[PDB]
Each structure stands twice: as structure tokens, then as C-alpha cells.
Design a protein around this ligand. Structure first.
Ligand SMILES: Nc1ncnc2c1ncn2[C@@H]1O[C@H](COP(=O)(O)OP(=O)(O)O)[C@@H](O)[C@H]1O
Ligand SMILES: Nc1ncnc2c1ncn2[C@@H]1O[C@H](COP(=O)(O)OP(=O)(O)O)[C@@H](O)[C@H]1O
Ligand code: BEF
Ligand code: BEF
Lengths: 266, 244
């Protein structure tokens, strides 16, 4: 039993046994409506801002809740920085572009820094002590611990209201392919079950699931929105819509300032 | 009733099918990812509301989605493309999301009564196999799930034969395939070079096995120019207005 889900401040998060028994039936009555009712229901989907105007205009609002957003790219392209920015912007009010919910950060590469959270909170004018208490951080060392963290996340999401679930490099613990053959099936199964559990959580709790994928120079669901991060010339970073059920392939520009994601300061 | 054929939005695809999607039978569209299955379904869900002279079916559309990829924005886009009022187009489409095989099967029971009440012309089952391809670890359940899919296809055939609706099911491609037996028309969608999307008549009792090219523009399919309740879905088929 490793360290479970702690907060960015360091204190341990305690879970009631009723919540554990309430989510064990998970991972195992809707009717016909007119397309107008469903289009209205999609207009009610809370979308979390990213701090960048051009990025929010590219996504027509921001990170959509209820689905999986997969940000992939090369090293030092802004995935972890965008995750740190979202982990604080999700606590903003709905009128300010937030989700009014706590954040959840599953780190697999040891690149979690509460200092960036404090910086972006000072940017948006929030209490630095409150934003660190509304972010449940958990470090994962292997795939089994990752899935156990997902189980603990399902247990936690019922007591308190969460709006964002971050999986920083979900493939970091899976891309340890030092073995020859054989593991390419078991690891694929584990990753597929992990993605399906993420989809189940996103559908059940309406939480925006944002996952990070390292690309050197997977089985994405049809509803998954895929973003590709690339470095341009200078500080200008380019985000492209690789695949989206509702958005066509387009590009936008953004930058990473000391306070997080923003527009390119030319 | 006489057989109506629905315009697919692409001239080459309409001439390939000698009119378009045939009603009363099953049309199985299968292919890889990002091949145009969901986009063709979205285009058909609006083109089936056109008058018979314009290549429509003069009936409401039914969209049973299983992957969360139903966007009425595409319907509004293709309705503006065909010059139809978006309100009447979105009001004549009954949408339902299925989460498991049991729900996907039970939705057709309600669909029967819905087609009894109001006139429907198109029943879309987007990824009818996605909930059945949940092999996961049970990659050999076979007859356990083969009997459920058999009853699902039997109900699809029953509805298509009784109400004369065009049943279009989507299949994802990477004991005997009962889908190949239950489906009359079979289209294979492949990705050529670039936006070159190749649609091939893989099997048809009347249409020859030929191929055609098409693309997915911002207004739908086109040619490369070289318990379970129902609220307002119970309303009758309202013919779409012009709004232009
Ligand atoms: N304290 C900081 N102030 C401003 N920019 C920073 C700071 N720390 C990192 N960055 C920027 O963020 C980028 C790091 O991206 P990161 O998200 O860590 O890559 P990855 O997606 O591989 O995790 C660097 O290019 C750097 O310019
Ligand atoms: N709004 C849009 N404008 C232009 N092209 C689009 C739009 N939405 C999707 N597309 C194109 O349609 C394709 C999606 O095909 P789709 O039918 O969703 O795949 P599948 O058959 O796996 O469901 C993408 O490759 C994309 O290029
Ligand atoms: F911290 Be990362 F995603 F490289
Ligand atoms: F939208 Be899919 F992949 F049918």
C-alpha cells in the first residue's frame, strides 16, 4: 500500500467507506430524444478555459467536460505546463471560464510542481492556499499503482465535486518496453482498460479527463479529442486539432509565460 | 410499399448506388478510423428528410449512437448546405445513446412504436459492433454474443421490412459473420491518398462491385471537384422549410 491521493499542500485525503462500497459496482434507462434537445444539452456542457484566448477560440470554449482530451507531442512542448494551468483554471467560476470543481493530478514522471499552481493562481487572483487544497496529487510508479489511483479517484469523486482529472504521461509507465516480445499484449490490455476506466469516469462524473502522451519524433476512442503540440520558431508554440468528433483540423498559437498558458506576447 | 432511394449528398456515390441508400434493406458501411462512416451517417440523417423528387425519403431520421460522436452541428451544416431550416431538420431526428448491448437491443423496441406513430425513413446504428466488439478479455465468447447480435440484426430486418425504413449500420474494421448475411447492401470505405476517400460496393445482389471517390467537406459528404422514454420525438414528420 503506497501513498494514496494526497493534496498539493501535503495533507492526506481521507475517504469514507460508503464511497468505496458505492463505486465497487463500477467498471463492469436512457431513451430517444430529438436532436434539438441533445444540441441544447451539449450547449450546457461546461468547458474549462486554458488561459489562452486563441486556444479557447480553437476549441470553441476550451477543455470539454465528459470526454477525454489527449494532448500529445515531443519533449518540452507544454503538456505538463498546460496540465498545471488547467489544474487551477478548473477551479474558476463558470462565468470566468472554469468548472467550479477541484482538480486531480496523477503524475507518472515526477514533474509535478505546486509552484506553477501558485503562480497561475496569483495570475488569476486566487488564494494560493486554497488552490493547493483543491488539487489532489498522486505520484504513480507502475501501471498497477496507476489503476489503483484510478480506483481511488472513482472513490473520491463522489464526496467532493471534481471537474478535472489529469493523467500526466499515462504512457510513461507503459513505454518501458525493454522486453522483447510478449509484453506488447499485456501492456496493451492494461492501457486499454485504463483508457476505458477513464471514459467511464468521464461519463459518470462529467469530469474533464486530460491525458498526456509522449511522442518520439494510443487506441483513441471515437469521442476522444486529440491535440498535437509542436514548437514553432522562437517562443511560439502551435497546437493542432489532430482528431475531433465536432471540430475540424485547425491550428492555433500559444505560449508559456511565467504564470502559465497564455497568448504569444509579440 | 415501393422502394425509395435516399441521396447520399455525393453525385458519384449516388450514381454508384444507382440512386443512393436503398430503403427496406440493411446497408452496412465498414472501414477503418477516420474513413467517413459517421459523417455519411450525419449526411443521410438530413438527406432522408428531403422530398422524394429531391432524393429524400420524406420521413424522420433515427440515430442510435454508441460512441458519443453524434453532433447536431454537422446536421445544421448539411441542412444549410441543402437549404433547409435547421430547426425542422433537428426536430425530425430522434437520437438515442446506447451504453451496452442490452440497451442497444431495447432501443429498437421503442423504435418500433415510434415508427408506428410517426413516419420514419432512416434508422442509423452508428457502430452497432462497438458494444459487441467489447472482447476485452473475452476474445472467444462467440456463441454467447453471437446470439444477441443475431437477434439485434433480426429486429433490424423486421423494422426495415415492416416500415420500409432504410437501416444503415456502421462497423469498425482494423463462426460465420451474421452481419454479412443480414445486410443486403455493403459499402467498404478506405482512405486513399490525402482526402481521397474510396467507397467500394463490397457486396450487393443487384449493384456491381465498383468504386467511387468522395470527400468530407465542411458541409458533409461531397465530391472532389477535379423506462426508455420519448418526449418531443413522438411528433410527426414536419417537412423542412426553406429558410432561404
Ligand atoms: N518557470 C517557468 N517560466 C516560464 N516558462 C517555463 C517555466 N518552466 C518551464 N517553462 C516552459 O515550459 C516548457 C516545458 O514544457 P513541459 O510541459 O515541461 O514539456 P513536456 O510536455 O515534455 O512535459 C519549456 O519549453 C519552457 O520554456
Ligand atoms: N467539421 C468538419 N469539417 C470538415 N471535415 C470534417 C469535419 N468533421 C470531420 N471531418 C472529417 O471527417 C473525418 C472523420 O470521419 P468519421 O466518419 O468521424 O470517422 P469514422 O468513420 O471512424 O466515424 C475526419 O478525417 C475529418 O477530416
Ligand atoms: F512532464 Be512531462 F509530460 F514531460
Ligand atoms: F465515428 Be465512428 F468511428 F463510427
Amino acid at each position: 500500500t503506497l501513498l494514496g491521493f494526497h493534496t498539493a499542500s501535503g495533507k492526506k485525503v481521507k475517504i469514507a467507506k460508503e464511497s468505496l462500497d458505492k463505486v465497487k459496482n463500477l467498471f463492469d434507462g436512457s431513451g430517444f430524444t430529438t436532436a434539438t434537445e441533445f444540441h441544447q444539452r451539449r450547449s450546457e456542457i461546461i468547458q474549462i478555459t486554458t488561459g489562452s484566448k486563441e486556444l479557447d477560440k480553437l476549441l470553441q470554449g476550451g477543455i470539454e467536460t465528459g470526454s477525454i482530451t489527449e494532448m500529445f507531442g515531443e519533449f518540452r512542448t507544454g503538456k505538463t505546463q498546460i496540465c498545471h494551468t488547467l489544474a487551477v483554471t478548473c477551479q474558476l467560476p463558470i462565468d470566468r471560464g472554469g468548472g467550479e470543481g477541484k482538480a486531480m493530478y496523477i503524475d507518472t514522471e515526477g514533474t509535478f510542481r505546486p509552484e506553477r499552481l501558485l503562480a497561475v493562481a496569483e495570475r488569476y487572483g486566487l488564494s494560493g492556499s486554497d488552490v493547493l487544497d483543491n488539487v489532489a496529487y498522486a505520484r504513480a510508479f507502475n501501471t498497477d499503482h496507476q489503476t489503483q489511483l484510478l480506483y481511488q479517484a472513482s472513490a473520491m469523486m463522489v464526496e467532493s465535486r471534481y471537474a478535472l482529472l489529469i493523467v500526466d504521461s499515462a504512457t510513461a509507465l507503459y513505454r518501458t518496453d525493454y522486453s522483447g516480445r510478449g509484453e506488447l499484449s499485456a501492456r496493451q490490455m492494461h492501457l486499454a482498460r485504463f483508457l476505458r476506466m477513464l471514459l467511464r469516469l468521464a461519463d459518470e462524473f462529467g469530469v474533464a479527463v486530460v491525458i498526456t502522451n509522449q511522442v518520439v519524433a494510443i487506441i483513441a476512442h471515437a469521442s476522444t479529442t486529440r491535440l498535437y503540440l509542436r514548437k514553432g520558431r522562437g517562443e511560439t508554440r502551435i497546437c493542432k486539432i489532430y482528431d475531433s468528433p465536432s471540430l475540424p483540423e485547425a491550428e492555433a498559437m500559444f505560449a508559456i509565460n511565467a504564470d502559465g498558458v497564455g497568448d504569444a506576447k509579440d
